Amino acid sequence: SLAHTAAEYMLSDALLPDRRGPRLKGLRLELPLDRIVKFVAVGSPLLLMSLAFAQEFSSGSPISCFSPSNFSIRQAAYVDSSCWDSLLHHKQDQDKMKSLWPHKALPYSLLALALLMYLPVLLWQYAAVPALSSDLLFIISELDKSYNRSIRLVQHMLKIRQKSSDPYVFWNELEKARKERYFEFPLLERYLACKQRSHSLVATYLLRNSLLLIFTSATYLYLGHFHLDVFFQEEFSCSIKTGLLSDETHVPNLITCRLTSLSIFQIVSLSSVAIYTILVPVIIYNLTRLCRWDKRLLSVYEMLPAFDLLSRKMLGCPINDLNVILLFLRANISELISFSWLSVLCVLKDHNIDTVVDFMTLLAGLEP
Amino acid sequence: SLAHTAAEYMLSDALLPDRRGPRLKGLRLELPLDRIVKFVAVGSPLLLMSLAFAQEFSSGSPISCFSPSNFSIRQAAYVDSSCWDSLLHHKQDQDKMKSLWPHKALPYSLLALALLMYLPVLLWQYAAVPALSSDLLFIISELDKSYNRSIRLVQHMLKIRQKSSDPYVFWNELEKARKERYFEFPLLERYLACKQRSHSLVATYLLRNSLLLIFTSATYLYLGHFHLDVFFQEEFSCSIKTGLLSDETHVPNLITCRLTSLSIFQIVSLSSVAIYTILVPVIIYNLTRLCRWDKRLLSVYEMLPAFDLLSRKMLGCPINDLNVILLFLRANISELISFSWLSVLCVLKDHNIDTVVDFMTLLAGLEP
Amino acid sequence: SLAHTAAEYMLSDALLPDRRGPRLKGLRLELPLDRIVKFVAVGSPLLLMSLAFAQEFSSGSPISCFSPSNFSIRQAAYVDSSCWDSLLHHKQDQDKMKSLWPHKALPYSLLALALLMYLPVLLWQYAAVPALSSDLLFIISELDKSYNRSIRLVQHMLKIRQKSSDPYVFWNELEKARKERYFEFPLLERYLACKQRSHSLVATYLLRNSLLLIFTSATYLYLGHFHLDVFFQEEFSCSIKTGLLSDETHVPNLITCRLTSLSIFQIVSLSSVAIYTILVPVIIYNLTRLCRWDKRLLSVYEMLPAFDLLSRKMLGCPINDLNVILLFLRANISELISFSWLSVLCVLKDHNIDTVVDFMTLLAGLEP
Amino acid sequence: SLAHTAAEYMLSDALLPDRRGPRLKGLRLELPLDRIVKFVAVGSPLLLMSLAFAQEFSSGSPISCFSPSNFSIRQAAYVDSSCWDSLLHHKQDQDKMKSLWPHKALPYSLLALALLMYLPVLLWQYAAVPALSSDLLFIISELDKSYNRSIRLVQHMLKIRQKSSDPYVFWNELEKARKERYFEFPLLERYLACKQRSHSLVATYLLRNSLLLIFTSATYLYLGHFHLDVFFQEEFSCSIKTGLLSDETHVPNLITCRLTSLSIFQIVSLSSVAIYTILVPVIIYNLTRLCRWDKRLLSVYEMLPAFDLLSRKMLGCPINDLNVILLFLRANISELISFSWLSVLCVLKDHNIDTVVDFMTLLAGLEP
Amino acid sequence: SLAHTAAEYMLSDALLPDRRGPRLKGLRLELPLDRIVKFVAVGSPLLLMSLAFAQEFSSGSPISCFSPSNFSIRQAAYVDSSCWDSLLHHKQDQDKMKSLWPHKALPYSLLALALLMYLPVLLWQYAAVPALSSDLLFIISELDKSYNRSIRLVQHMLKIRQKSSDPYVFWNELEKARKERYFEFPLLERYLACKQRSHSLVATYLLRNSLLLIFTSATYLYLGHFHLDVFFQEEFSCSIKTGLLSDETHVPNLITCRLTSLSIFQIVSLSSVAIYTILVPVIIYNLTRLCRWDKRLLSVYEMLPAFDLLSRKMLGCPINDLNVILLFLRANISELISFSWLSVLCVLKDHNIDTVVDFMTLLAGLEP
């Protein structure tokens, strides 16, 4: 089956024979909702195509004809196969030969839709995967040095607070650590600043979502212009004496042809509208997820030294590559190492009380 | 077969190509009853759909017509394929053209039910799996330090009891250990306290069960409103001269069409009711599991130092995240390490006798 | 084929993707006779279902009709498909319309039997596998310390017997070893003591066997009440003018329908009785196994120190969890380590002669 | 195909998912001729069943009818399907309605034979595999200590023979080694002695062979009583007016049915006789292989110290467990270690010459 | 299916059984656009061939005939199979017997196109893969020595700049490093010098793209010369009395043959034009990609010592092997090692400011 092949040729990963290395293992280069949107918008036309060719209808004939009794078996087969390629309602109302080509082109239309909804995926894989992968690996590598540099080399501050009045050292001493050379990363503040003035991944994300939106609008136009007209039309009077049979003696207007699979066509025309009006607001939500700043976890991120640079860069127009990279990082911060200490600081959600709260919690997070 | 694909596309794990690491190995993120409920409520519509399309009926025709002898083979095939898309019992009792569309839509209805019962599963995997996995890994990591800190570093209490009168040291000495710095964990009492006031996973669990309950109720409404009416209706008098055939000379009311697969429809309509009235009280039991506090094993848990914090937090309204995490932990406490010492203390189920019972058992549980 | 899927979905292990660890490798949680009983009672209905749908009959029609010559091909197909859903022998003896629904429901009855015989298996896997696995692993771990503690640390008794008169030391010295602290396990005598008074797995085993017994009795009732009546009935006079065809001119009583696959039905009705009469006494023997105490190997077990506790606990009512534990242990005692020394002591089957017999055999069993 | 499944469900190993350990790797628990006998007696009925259902006959009809020209297609199909379930030659010679049920039951008979010939295999796997495996592993483990104890620790005898007159030391010195403590195994002479008086595996072997012999005799009786009568009977005059058709006007005795696949039945009835006449004397040879003692290699086995115990036990009634165990050992003695030195001593096949022959050969077999 | 085999025989890698070593792992010997162009230009004819042979049309007959009623079934089958091999419109307009062979040859034409579009791929694999692989491995092997030789052995320049006035040492000291023996590679300037004057791979790339361009032009000529004429021609009057049937009495001019799958032919003739009009400008872009020099990243490459040689050789005619090797290198520069430091220097995109910018960034890129 064609859908069987398209199941793995598309709708999944088509890079390398896998089991290669850290190129894809441990790295999530697609958001979960983006993945589910691609899955639904790619497999649903394929699923409908399979249902058209499924066991629900054991092949048979997609069209039938009421040929007169004088016709033999072969003549009737010819007259019912000559209407499946000359679909023209020769109505008596001049001679408006309305066509019914969408019924024949429905599997081809579904294949075209399936191939069209894979264009945003290919664009994402070819124009954003390498750069975003490099940026994410870079950021992860630079931020994994924020545990052996925020507590282990900052635990002498414990030795100085415990000697003197600890509440006083909690506020009058931290400026020495803040002015230390090793305390802050000397290149993150430049990497992020360089990425702020660049618009390379925001355009790619916006194009990837807008392609799906525009293709959904085109699908609506297709199903509202070509369908919805031949939707309750079940009998069309075709004609075979429109050529070399004109000089014959048999039914000129072979009235009352019938489309056997009209119900399947009607079901598909509604299932390709409902399952896309489901996705219409989801794409808009994905678009708005980039245009809105996030400050819900800034309180704990600002306390950490390395993430202070990310927290400070919170101002300006929302559309920067920093936004996309941060959206991807927050979905990938907890790979194997940050999955053990960053999740600790969720109790701080209510700087007077925050000054003393780390009197026991911060040192209690020691690995041994 | 579509069911063959849906067997692995759904009804199983669809995350990663597996063999990745400790993300899923050794971690049970679904309760066994939840797993069996999902299996039964997802595969049963798929199984019934497969049975409708199985070898039990070698395809054939799902509808038959008593066309007159004047009709040829092609005319009869047309007149029996024009009733499978115009199912309308033109009764003589005005002209109540009762429809029989559920017979046609039954495979589509079963597919819709199968896709609808997978919505709670997807909601669970997308909204609770990461947070609950992080919480369970955190709790397991913090509780695995309760064996090299409850007996190995507490075996000096053995040295102090054996020198003096052991029964006296059994009650006047434990306060020194209870007030020790290392005896109690300094962050568990805050992690659990923070999780008390957060309602995040309790809402997800309630929603996941309520979605299945509401969908079962919707299935009951569907099978009681559309079915149960066309249930003993086997012959419906269709009509084909309702259009371009009106100006013809043949049977106007082609009486006595017949639904060949009515028995299949009747069997499905009862099997989709029985196997869901089976699941109706199980979902309620799953819901009541969370709403009821558990104290059957508090006696041994309170004795252990780390689990004393869990045992003390036993008061309040039942709906907290701690109950969900505890229900998941008690099904996952015995992974590889607690499977050797926690199962020992089942003899204590009847603090005078309990004061002396550990005179030999506690030290006898040594690993060497 | 449905049987092809049910071969692996049921009738085998459905836990984990395997190759995980020591959870199942080296551990036998099902008795061999229980395994073969499940195999036969689960696959036999599936095998009969496959044989009904096998190549032995190339599909065809499960019913045939002697329609008059006036009927066309389509009319005869309709009149032979309108009786596979209206099986009613309209006998002339008032008007006892005896039904022949078991012929239609036989594949569904076989599927119901296959799913019903899997209920005891699911009950065993969900209600007794974890607890029994924990108990067996615990007991094996505690008994593997009975080789480096029964000869290696007891070989100084060789040094004390060889210096003095060895026959005298064979009887006057063993009391010092029997009163030693390390000679006896200090927690086995309590674990087994707690396990005798607990009835948890004995009830599960009784229920698992009784479910199969009750389901076999229900199968006998089903095949004796619904079958055995339509067993030699091959021709039943149907009726098609029982509806909208009443106002027609054709055979009212379309006599002599015929069930083409009656021989298959008769073969199944006897094969599902014989192969369950085979299993009836086997289940009874499985129940008897637990109800009778075993003392055939007590002579050698009592000599060993660790197994002396098991040997002493031989009195009381037979139904205890310890009985099931011992039954599962004796089928799993020889995993990899006891497979080399416990099998040695089979010569002792006839305490005067037994006092001396270990003069050479016991020390000769040394590992080097 | 059913034969496709039975190819791996039977006729092979059905224990564990394999790749487990030394339970089956390197251990041969079935004799090669026993394996070939099981293969031939199990797959041959399966092969004949497949041939009956193979492409050699493209399905078609196993029975044909000479219905009169008045009959239509459906009437003829009914009358040729009503004789395949009412096989009764209504001969005119009173009214001896000879039945031809073996033609219908031949695939079922072949399946019954295939399942019956697998009973001895299951009996062997369930009643003797564990005990024989334990015994063989025990014997191999104890005999692998016969190389570092027969030459390496006996090479000081070389030092004493070379100093004095070597021919004299070849006969007056060996008694000191024969009386040494470490020279002889102190438990093999008791293990074999205990096994001599136990008849456990000999009965199992005799039962396994006798079951196949009795089942072959039953097959002969089946093919000589039910077959060989309907063997040249190709046309039988059936009757359909033996019921509700009695009050009709058509051929009362529908003469001359025909069994289309009679030649297949004739070929099977001879191929299931010849292929078992082939196996009749092989089973008897397997039975006699245990009843006859073996002394062809005693000369070299007696020279070796460990095998001297096996060689000495050369008297008594043949039926003992050591006969079976030695038959299995001689087929498994050369696993990986005895495959290098035991095969050396084949030149000694003609104790005067044997006294000196080891002057160079015995020491030349050194591993370095 | 033939397309199923051609899916893996072509359209993928056909060298070695894979899992061999570093011959293909980590090396990208095809550009992504070249890969996608090959995929589309190879699978699209195969996909159209599959669609012509797919379930969209359940085989049937590719031609139909209006044979007179006197014809039987066999005569009509002969007269409709004698025209699928004698497609000749015997028009009455002298006797222009126009042929319709493209309808018969369309699957063969698609197979020929699929095999023709694979010729450039085979040419690339056989004439450029070994040499280009050797060159790329050589180049990466030589440039991997540009990290432990540009900062680690140049960090003494830090020691000399920090002692004196750092801005002065930034411009008056670098000439000593530039004249050092180890600073510059002594063979890269000769390898590249030899490679500029050699035109070996540029000719191969030009031929590979020009073959696809010429084959697309040939496809256009084929579909514009043979097709587009029999495009709206559905009925052609055949003739069967053109042989030994001339002396017969039946329809001489058997009018109105009909091509049942004409719509499939029309769809293919347009899908093989549009899908290649899509590829026409892409091939031209691939050709121009080498004809244009690249200087967008020269600023950072010139700063690095090893890449200074590549940056300097920027002059001359665009067609050299060096351009091909550079185009392949920039698609493979970030394999596993340059993926961590080369991506750092993207901030430099605006030598006064550049003199000081490395005051902190260059040393901050240290591996520890």
PDB file of C-alpha atoms in Angstrom, chain B residues 164-269:
ATOM      1  CA  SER B 164      24.196  -0.289  79.515  1.00  0.00           C
ATOM      2  CA  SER B 165      20.807  -1.876  80.238  1.00  0.00           C
ATOM      3  CA  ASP B 166      19.481  -2.406  76.710  1.00  0.00           C
ATOM      4  CA  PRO B 167      15.756  -2.021  77.605  1.00  0.00           C
ATOM      5  CA  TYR B 168      16.521   1.343  79.225  1.00  0.00           C
ATOM      6  CA  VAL B 169      18.543   2.596  76.244  1.00  0.00           C
ATOM      7  CA  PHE B 170      15.641   1.501  74.016  1.00  0.00           C
ATOM      8  CA  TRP B 171      13.633   4.461  75.374  1.00  0.00           C
ATOM      9  CA  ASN B 172      16.111   6.959  76.934  1.00  0.00           C
ATOM     10  CA  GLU B 173      18.716   7.760  74.241  1.00  0.00           C
ATOM     11  CA  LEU B 174      16.705   7.948  71.017  1.00  0.00           C
ATOM     12  CA  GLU B 175      16.054  11.658  71.599  1.00  0.00           C
ATOM     13  CA  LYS B 176      19.752  12.387  71.027  1.00  0.00           C
ATOM     14  CA  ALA B 177      19.609  10.669  67.633  1.00  0.00           C
ATOM     15  CA  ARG B 178      16.305  12.406  66.847  1.00  0.00           C
ATOM     16  CA  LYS B 179      17.950  15.796  67.494  1.00  0.00           C
ATOM     17  CA  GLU B 180      21.050  14.990  65.424  1.00  0.00           C
ATOM     18  CA  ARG B 181      21.742  17.090  62.339  1.00  0.00           C
ATOM     19  CA  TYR B 182      22.321  14.221  59.899  1.00  0.00           C
ATOM     20  CA  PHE B 183      19.465  12.056  61.211  1.00  0.00           C
ATOM     21  CA  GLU B 184      16.706  13.929  59.351  1.00  0.00           C
ATOM     22  CA  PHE B 185      16.780  15.144  55.765  1.00  0.00           C
ATOM     23  CA  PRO B 186      16.865  18.972  55.703  1.00  0.00           C
ATOM     24  CA  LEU B 187      14.987  19.432  52.402  1.00  0.00           C
ATOM     25  CA  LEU B 188      12.384  16.641  52.236  1.00  0.00           C
ATOM     26  CA  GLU B 189      10.226  18.378  54.859  1.00  0.00           C
ATOM     27  CA  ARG B 190      10.213  21.456  52.588  1.00  0.00           C
ATOM     28  CA  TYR B 191       9.765  19.614  49.278  1.00  0.00           C
ATOM     29  CA  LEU B 192       6.730  17.740  50.612  1.00  0.00           C
ATOM     30  CA  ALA B 193       5.375  20.910  52.236  1.00  0.00           C
ATOM     31  CA  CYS B 194       5.620  22.748  48.910  1.00  0.00           C
ATOM     32  CA  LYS B 195       3.935  19.841  47.126  1.00  0.00           C
ATOM     33  CA  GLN B 196       1.088  19.924  49.673  1.00  0.00           C
ATOM     34  CA  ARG B 197      -0.125  23.355  48.526  1.00  0.00           C
ATOM     35  CA  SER B 198       0.244  22.652  44.783  1.00  0.00           C
ATOM     36  CA  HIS B 199      -2.661  21.076  42.879  1.00  0.00           C
ATOM     37  CA  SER B 200      -1.071  20.183  39.536  1.00  0.00           C
ATOM     38  CA  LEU B 201      -1.108  16.399  39.090  1.00  0.00           C
ATOM     39  CA  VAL B 202      -4.331  15.786  41.035  1.00  0.00           C
ATOM     40  CA  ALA B 203      -6.180  17.862  38.433  1.00  0.00           C
ATOM     41  CA  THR B 204      -4.497  15.927  35.620  1.00  0.00           C
ATOM     42  CA  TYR B 205      -5.444  12.556  37.136  1.00  0.00           C
ATOM     43  CA  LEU B 206      -9.032  13.652  37.768  1.00  0.00           C
ATOM     44  CA  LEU B 207      -9.299  15.001  34.215  1.00  0.00           C
ATOM     45  CA  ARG B 208      -7.822  11.821  32.730  1.00  0.00           C
ATOM     46  CA  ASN B 209     -10.353   9.615  34.508  1.00  0.00           C
ATOM     47  CA  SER B 210     -13.266  12.015  33.951  1.00  0.00           C
ATOM     48  CA  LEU B 211     -12.549  12.133  30.214  1.00  0.00           C
ATOM     49  CA  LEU B 212     -12.936   8.353  30.010  1.00  0.00           C
ATOM     50  CA  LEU B 213     -16.094   8.499  32.136  1.00  0.00           C
ATOM     51  CA  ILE B 214     -17.637  11.253  29.994  1.00  0.00           C
ATOM     52  CA  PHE B 215     -16.689   9.449  26.782  1.00  0.00           C
ATOM     53  CA  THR B 216     -18.290   6.241  28.072  1.00  0.00           C
ATOM     54  CA  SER B 217     -21.438   8.227  28.876  1.00  0.00           C
ATOM     55  CA  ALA B 218     -21.334   9.701  25.363  1.00  0.00           C
ATOM     56  CA  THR B 219     -20.988   6.182  23.949  1.00  0.00           C
ATOM     57  CA  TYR B 220     -24.050   5.125  25.946  1.00  0.00           C
ATOM     58  CA  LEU B 221     -25.985   8.107  24.585  1.00  0.00           C
ATOM     59  CA  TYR B 222     -24.833   7.322  21.035  1.00  0.00           C
ATOM     60  CA  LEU B 223     -25.862   3.661  21.230  1.00  0.00           C
ATOM     61  CA  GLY B 224     -29.146   4.529  22.949  1.00  0.00           C
ATOM     62  CA  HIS B 225     -30.220   7.349  20.624  1.00  0.00           C
ATOM     63  CA  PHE B 226     -29.103   6.239  17.155  1.00  0.00           C
ATOM     64  CA  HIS B 227     -29.018   2.485  17.777  1.00  0.00           C
ATOM     65  CA  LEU B 228     -31.794   0.544  19.575  1.00  0.00           C
ATOM     66  CA  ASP B 229     -34.147   1.959  16.922  1.00  0.00           C
ATOM     67  CA  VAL B 230     -32.657   0.311  13.820  1.00  0.00           C
ATOM     68  CA  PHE B 231     -31.970  -2.861  15.789  1.00  0.00           C
ATOM     69  CA  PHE B 232     -34.690  -5.277  14.638  1.00  0.00           C
ATOM     70  CA  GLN B 233     -35.196  -3.530  11.273  1.00  0.00           C
ATOM     71  CA  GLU B 234     -33.998  -5.962   8.601  1.00  0.00           C
ATOM     72  CA  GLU B 235     -36.044  -5.076   5.498  1.00  0.00           C
ATOM     73  CA  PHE B 236     -36.418  -1.503   4.278  1.00  0.00           C
ATOM     74  CA  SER B 237     -38.246  -0.660   1.058  1.00  0.00           C
ATOM     75  CA  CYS B 238     -35.923   1.669  -0.843  1.00  0.00           C
ATOM     76  CA  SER B 239     -36.711   3.608  -4.023  1.00  0.00           C
ATOM     77  CA  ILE B 240     -34.544   4.429  -7.025  1.00  0.00           C
ATOM     78  CA  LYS B 241     -36.996   6.496  -9.101  1.00  0.00           C
ATOM     79  CA  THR B 242     -36.318   9.505  -6.850  1.00  0.00           C
ATOM     80  CA  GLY B 243     -34.542  11.466  -9.563  1.00  0.00           C
ATOM     81  CA  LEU B 244     -33.558  10.997 -13.197  1.00  0.00           C
ATOM     82  CA  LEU B 245     -35.218   7.541 -13.199  1.00  0.00           C
ATOM     83  CA  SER B 246     -38.662   9.030 -12.492  1.00  0.00           C
ATOM     84  CA  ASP B 247     -39.558   8.820 -16.207  1.00  0.00           C
ATOM     85  CA  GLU B 248     -38.935   5.080 -16.456  1.00  0.00           C
ATOM     86  CA  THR B 249     -40.993   1.870 -16.434  1.00  0.00           C
ATOM     87  CA  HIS B 250     -39.744  -0.346 -13.601  1.00  0.00           C
ATOM     88  CA  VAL B 251     -40.376  -1.024  -9.908  1.00  0.00           C
ATOM     89  CA  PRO B 252     -41.024   2.424  -8.355  1.00  0.00           C
ATOM     90  CA  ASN B 253     -40.665   1.201  -4.774  1.00  0.00           C
ATOM     91  CA  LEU B 254     -37.973  -1.483  -4.993  1.00  0.00           C
ATOM     92  CA  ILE B 255     -39.355  -3.157  -1.901  1.00  0.00           C
ATOM     93  CA  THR B 256     -37.471  -5.438   0.483  1.00  0.00           C
ATOM     94  CA  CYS B 257     -33.878  -4.391   0.606  1.00  0.00           C
ATOM     95  CA  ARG B 258     -31.980  -6.278   3.291  1.00  0.00           C
ATOM     96  CA  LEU B 259     -28.988  -5.569   5.528  1.00  0.00           C
ATOM     97  CA  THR B 260     -26.848  -8.696   5.247  1.00  0.00           C
ATOM     98  CA  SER B 261     -24.590  -7.807   8.204  1.00  0.00           C
ATOM     99  CA  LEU B 262     -27.345  -6.914  10.683  1.00  0.00           C
ATOM    100  CA  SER B 263     -26.156  -9.625  13.081  1.00  0.00           C
ATOM    101  CA  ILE B 264     -22.692  -8.034  13.099  1.00  0.00           C
ATOM    102  CA  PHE B 265     -24.263  -4.682  13.985  1.00  0.00           C
ATOM    103  CA  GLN B 266     -26.369  -6.247  16.756  1.00  0.00           C
ATOM    104  CA  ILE B 267     -23.361  -8.068  18.229  1.00  0.00           C
ATOM    105  CA  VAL B 268     -21.245  -4.898  18.147  1.00  0.00           C
ATOM    106  CA  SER B 269     -23.975  -2.745  19.704  1.00  0.00           C
TER     107      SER B 269
END
